[PDB]
Amino acid sequence: KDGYKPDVKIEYVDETGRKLTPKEAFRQLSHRFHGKGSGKMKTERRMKKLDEEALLKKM
RNA sequence: AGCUUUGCGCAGUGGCAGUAUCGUAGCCAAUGAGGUCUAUCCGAGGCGCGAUUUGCUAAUUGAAAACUUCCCAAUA
């Protein structure tokens, strides 16, 4: 061994940069495994939730 | 001529909602169902059935919780 301490800290942060929740991370992993994404209503709900969260974070 | 009584039906408001609201279809019942007051007084409900139906929205779980295609790659 060369001799050092591992500087490893891995995570699952979405491509948008937001750190996916463990439930959200499991949902993303299951979507990737099943090869199927969110539906139209799911997309609308996600967009509304993201917009509300962004507006709350604004002020 | 203006108002108004039983008020009715429409629309708005307030409140109530398991004891209640109603059908009650089973039964008695304006040809009296019921009693400590009132008994030579009072006079229309009670026993049993079943629910409180119409829609919208958020969320919640799930891999997907639904409304007409889809994951992909250098560009335009």
**A29 CA: nearest nucleotide by C1':** B63
Q: Which nt is closest to the CA of A34, judged by C1'?
A: B63
Strand nucleotide closest to residue A48 (CA to C1'): B58
Query: How determined?
Result: cryo-EM
Q: Which strand B nucleotides have any atom less than 7 A from protein CB atoms?
A: 58-59, 61-68, 70-71
Where b means 16+ CB within 10 Å and e means fewer, A35-48 reads eeeeeeeeeeeeee
Q: What is the resolution of this structure in A?
A: 4.1
**Residue A25 near residue A15, CB atoms below 8 Å:** no
CA–CA gap between residue A30 and residue A44 (Å, rounded):
20
